[PDB]
A paper describes a structure:
At later time points, the first intermediate amyloid disappears and we observe many different intermediate amyloid filaments, with structures that depend on the reaction conditions. At the end of both assembly reactions, most intermediate amyloids disappear and filaments with the same ordered cores as those from human brains remain.
The use of sodium chloride instead of magnesium chloride leads to the formation of filaments with ordered cores that are identical to those extracted from the brains of individuals with chronic traumatic encephalopathy (CTE). After 720 min, all reactions contained CTE type I filaments. The presence of sodium chloride in the CTE reaction affected the conformation of the β-helix turn in all intermediate amyloids that formed after the FIA and the final CTE structures, which showed a more open β-helix turn than in the Alzheimer fold, together with the presence of an extra density inside the β-helix turn. Being the product of a long disease process, tau PHFs and CTE filaments probably represent a thermodynamically stable state.
Author numbering:
A (entry chain B), B (entry chain D), C (entry chain F), D (entry chain C), E (entry chain A), F (entry chain E): 305 to 379
Amino acid sequence: SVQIVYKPVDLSKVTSKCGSLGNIHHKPGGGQVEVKSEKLDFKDRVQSKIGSLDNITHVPGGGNKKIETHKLTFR
Amino acid sequence: SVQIVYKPVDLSKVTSKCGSLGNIHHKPGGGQVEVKSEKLDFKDRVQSKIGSLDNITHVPGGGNKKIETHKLTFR
Amino acid sequence: SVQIVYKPVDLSKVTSKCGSLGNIHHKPGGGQVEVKSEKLDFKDRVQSKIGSLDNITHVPGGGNKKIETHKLTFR
Amino acid sequence: SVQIVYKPVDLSKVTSKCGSLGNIHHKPGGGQVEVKSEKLDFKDRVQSKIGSLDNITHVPGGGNKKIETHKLTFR
Amino acid sequence: SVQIVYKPVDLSKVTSKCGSLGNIHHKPGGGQVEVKSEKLDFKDRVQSKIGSLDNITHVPGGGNKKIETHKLTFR
Amino acid sequence: SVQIVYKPVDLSKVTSKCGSLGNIHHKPGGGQVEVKSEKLDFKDRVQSKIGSLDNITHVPGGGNKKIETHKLTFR
């Protein structure tokens, strides 16, 4: 016969302390953007993005990550 | 025969402390954007984005993440 | 017969302290951008980005990451 | 005695020809402009301009200038 | 006695010809502009200009200049 | 007695010819501009200019200049 005991344990801690957070600035695309196009031929699919796109400012007062996995397998 | 005891345990903790949060600025796309197009031929599908799109400001007072998985498998 | 005991333990800690966080600046694409195009032939898919795209400012008041995995297998 | 005869003459001509005039662009101040001030003391007059001021576009189909003077003087 | 005779002449011509004029571009201040000031003391007059100012685009289809002066002076 | 005769003559011609004029670009101040100041004392007048000022684009389709003077003087 076979007997299996599986009891792993976690009690872990993650933390931050800050006296103050501030005076934070992000200014993507401050300059002029220009595009000019003539006589182009396209014979297959086209995708275009122009200007100030997808820019992120991300200022979490704290932000932390855990990942865990368990896979007990018989045959 | 086969007998299995599977009782994993987690008590883990996540935190932040901030005395004050403020004076945070995001100003994407401050400059002029311009596009001019002449005599283009397209013979298949087109997508276009122009200007200030999809920009994000994300300022959570705290924001944290856990992922966990268990996959106990017999045959 | 076979008997298996699997009971690892974690009590770990991760931390940060800051007296104050501030006066932080990010300014990508401060200069002028220009593109000019004539008489191009495309016989293939086309993908284009112009300007200030995807810039990230990421200012976590504290930020930490941990990953764990367990794989106990019989045959 | 004294006698004076003063009979100057001008018959001069000024001209332009243009077959067509067009596609003229002026774009002053295409980028973002920013000013920040703290704890300034002024004990006399202040004058200030900020932004896009006094810019000129001047496209006369023709534009020409003549100046003339006559100063006939006795004693 | 004294006699003075003053009878100068001008018959002159000034000209331009152009078959076409165009595709002219001026873009002063395409980039971002920034100013920051702290704790400044002024005890006399102040003048300030910031940004894109006084810029000129001048495209006369023809433009020409004549100046003339006559100064007959007795004693 | 005294007699004075002043009778000069001018017949001049001045010209330009162009088959076509175009594709002219002027782009001053394409890059980012920045100024930072702390704890300055002024006991005297101040004048300041920052950014893209006084830039000229000057494209006369034809452009010509002439100056003349006549000065007849007695004693």
